[PDB]
Amino acid sequence: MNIFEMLRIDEGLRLKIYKDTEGYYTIGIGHLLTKSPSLNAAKGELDKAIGRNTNGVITKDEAEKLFNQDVDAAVRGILRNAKLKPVYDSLDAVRRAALINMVFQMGETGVAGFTNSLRMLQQKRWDEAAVNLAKSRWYNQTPNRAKRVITTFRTGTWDAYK
Ligand SMILES: [Cl-]
Ligand SMILES: [Cl-]
């Protein structure tokens, strides 16, 4: 298991514009297109992203390409972030995958807002971090995906994904 297979399980794959759990226009492997209600505002962002007239549909390859860009940006954002970087650097390889997953889903800004849990992760207080992570809108809104990520942080294994 690696970050790519992990996120591919969490986000699924869809070749047609779809609405995410929050109701935003998405495509591929969890690639947010726009928070705008407009399906046209979304088709346009889509064309801009792919560099062709897609008419709301892309191929597997195109989805994978977006996905490679997104994981890369996720990692690079963590590394450029003063609050996130030190957490990441402190962690083992499995747990770094968990942090990257949260960033991919909620953006750097969002994750940086889990100040208390980040401090616990940094101190390697696993059980306490898992409890604090659960007190969040994130866990209440997407409990199954949250539990997987949280178990990954508590255990440092890929069991939740096995
Ligand atoms: Cl893009
Ligand atoms: Cl869920």
Quote the ligand 2 centre to 28 CA distance (angstroms): 18
Which runs of E-coded beta strand occur in 1-159? 14-19, 25-28, 31-34
Quote the ligand 2 centre to 83 CA distance (angstroms): 26
Q: Which CATH fold would you assign to the domain 1-162?
A: Lysozyme (1.10.530)
Which runs of E-coded beta strand occur in the chain? 14-19, 25-28, 31-34
Q: Is 90 annotated as a binding residue?
A: no
Catalytic residue among 11, 62, 70, 108: 11
Q: Give φ, ψ of 144 to 5 degrees.
A: -70, -45
Give 84's contacts (C-beta < 8 A, 6+ positions apart): 77, 78, 99, 103, 108, 111, 112, 118
Kindly list the domain boundaries of the chain, sorted by start residue. Answer: 1-162
Q: Using CA atoms in the order 49, 7, 27, 104, what is the torsion angle rounded to 10 degrees?
A: -60
Does 108 qualify as catalytic in the annotation?
no
Q: Look up residue 152 and give its two tokens.
A: 């990954």
Does 72 qualify as catalytic in the annotation?
no
Q: Is 114 annotated as a binding residue?
A: no
Q: Look up residue 138 and give its two tokens.
A: 């994130």
- Pairing of β 25-28 and β 31-34: antiparallel
